[PDB]
Structures are given as structure tokens and as C-alpha cells.
Amino acid sequence: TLVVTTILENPYLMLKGNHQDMEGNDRYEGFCVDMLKELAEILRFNYKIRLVGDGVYGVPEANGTWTGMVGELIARKADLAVAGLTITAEREKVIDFSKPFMTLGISILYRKGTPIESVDDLADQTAIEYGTIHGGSSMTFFQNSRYQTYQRMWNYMYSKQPSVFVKSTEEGIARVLNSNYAFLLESTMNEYYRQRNCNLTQIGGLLDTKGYGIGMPVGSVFRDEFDLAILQLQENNRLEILKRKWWEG
Ligand SMILES: C=C(C)[C@H]1CN[C@H](C(=O)O)[C@H]1CC(=O)O
């Protein structure tokens, strides 16, 4: 029985409408749940879904401790982390990842009727505030960039009061709809919320290209076979079908 650490995040992992009449794994739906099922049909493992204790994906502390689902993996509190867990060079030093099961990049979200046409335009004006989830992969992309536009954006987000950071994707989307705030978020989420809210638009293109991956502790015995199953899923178009099931509505 594999212990899977995860987090509530639309549409990867959600509580079913009538989740109180459910127990254990069957409380939950979504793309990651459907992916787990298909992976489990090939590889024949049982698993139990457990929501990350601290409610975070993963941030390094200055002393070397990781938080979030990354930390749970290093502590061996979970065998797998199944979420929109962005594969980055910093995380790769401290855990293993499967091959990627979805592609994405940093994107900008805003409410319609705007003359903001790009990330350089966004960074070069004062009227519209902008920001991201604190401690996520997108934040650290600006924080460590050598490019001046992104450096200027880091300096702004860092210093602005009141804070331009949000604690969740839900919090950011709400800030977009209700205030003059453009949200720095992964394109997967951008596509999702745009399809459910005709008022939302994308500013410019994608700022990078990345992957989500199943997180595992470093040296995990399960990595090889999960890579073999993900490839079979990829080559049978399963990951794409599932993405359409959860995104296109
Ligand atoms: C906090 C969330 C929603 C996660 C999801 N992927 C990124 C990560 O795994 O860090 C984070 C989002 C972002 O950085 O824009």
C-alpha cells in the first residue's frame, strides 16, 4: 500500500460534491485520482490518499529543511507525491521525479478590456498590481532571474504593501476578478479558470516551459516502473484524454 501525499487543487484533486457520504480515497476526484487509477491498473499497487499536513507544495528553508509535499517525501512520511508538482532543478537535488505527465509554463492572468499586452508592459506600469503564490515555483523564477524585466518584477513584488502575494490559486483568481491585479500562475491553471469565467484573459505568452511530475524520495525503488507506466499512458494518449476530461468543460 503506497502512501500518496497530495493537496486540494482544482481540477487535480478535489472533494466530491457529496464527500461526507464517502470514506478514504473515494472522498476525492480529479485528474490526479484518475491518473492514479490508470497507473494502479498497470502496476497493481494499493494506495491511500493523504492531504499534505502543512498545505504547501514545497519550499527550502535556509537551514536545509524542505516544507510541503517535498518535505514529506524527504522525511519518508509518503511514498509518492501526486499533484501539480513542478519539476525544478532545486527540487531535483532533494527528491526524485517521474517523467513528466503534463507540460506547462508561467503565465499571466487578468480581467478583460486591458491595454496590457505583454510581461514587459505589465512590469513597466503602476496602475495594475501583480503577484504570485508565495513560495511557489513561479515566484522563484522571478526571484532568481538574471533578466532585468524579471528582476524589476521581483523587486516590486518583494517590496509592495499591502502584500501582492496570495496563499492559494483560489485566492489569486478572486483577486483578479475583484481588484486591479494580474496573477502570475502556471498555464494549466490559467486555461482552467479561463474556461470557467469568460471575463478572464491571458496577457502575452508563456514565460518558460516546464513539467509536473510524481515526486518520490531520492533513490526510490518505485521510480523505474512508474516511468514505464507513464510512457505507456503517454503513448496510448491517456494523459491527454484525462486532461481533456478535466480541463475542457
Ligand atoms: C502553489 C501551487 C498552486 C503550485 C503548483 N505548481 C507550482 C509548484 O509546484 O511550485 C505552484 C504554483 C506556481 O508556482 O505558480
Coordinates of C-alpha atoms in Angstrom, one line a residue, residues 108-109 122 125-136 138-139 142 150-176 179-185:
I108 CA -0.2 35.9 -16.6
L109 CA -4.0 36.2 -15.8
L122 CA 3.0 44.8 -17.1
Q125 CA 3.4 50.3 -15.4
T126 CA 2.0 51.1 -12.0
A127 CA -1.8 51.0 -12.2
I128 CA -2.3 47.2 -12.2
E129 CA -0.6 45.4 -9.3
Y130 CA 0.7 41.9 -9.9
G131 CA 1.9 38.9 -8.0
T132 CA 2.0 35.2 -7.3
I133 CA 1.6 32.5 -4.7
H134 CA 4.4 33.0 -2.2
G135 CA 6.9 30.2 -2.1
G136 CA 5.8 28.5 -5.4
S138 CA 6.8 30.8 -10.3
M139 CA 7.8 33.2 -7.5
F142 CA 11.5 35.9 -10.8
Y150 CA 12.0 39.9 -14.2
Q151 CA 14.4 41.4 -11.7
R152 CA 12.3 44.6 -11.7
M153 CA 9.2 42.4 -11.2
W154 CA 10.9 40.6 -8.3
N155 CA 11.9 44.0 -6.6
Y156 CA 8.3 45.2 -6.9
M157 CA 6.6 42.0 -5.6
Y158 CA 9.0 41.8 -2.8
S159 CA 8.5 45.4 -1.5
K160 CA 4.9 46.3 -2.3
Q161 CA 2.5 46.9 0.6
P162 CA 0.0 45.7 1.2
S163 CA 1.3 42.4 0.0
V164 CA 0.9 41.3 -3.6
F165 CA 1.3 37.6 -2.6
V166 CA -1.5 35.2 -2.4
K167 CA -1.7 31.9 -0.4
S168 CA -3.6 29.8 -3.0
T169 CA -4.7 29.7 -6.6
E170 CA -8.3 30.3 -5.5
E171 CA -7.2 33.4 -3.6
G172 CA -5.4 34.7 -6.7
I173 CA -8.3 34.2 -9.2
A174 CA -10.6 36.1 -6.7
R175 CA -8.1 38.9 -6.5
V176 CA -8.1 39.1 -10.3
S179 CA -9.3 44.1 -7.8
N180 CA -6.7 45.5 -10.2
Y181 CA -4.4 42.6 -10.1
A182 CA -2.8 40.4 -12.6
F183 CA -1.8 36.9 -11.3
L184 CA 1.4 35.1 -12.1
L185 CA 0.4 31.4 -12.5

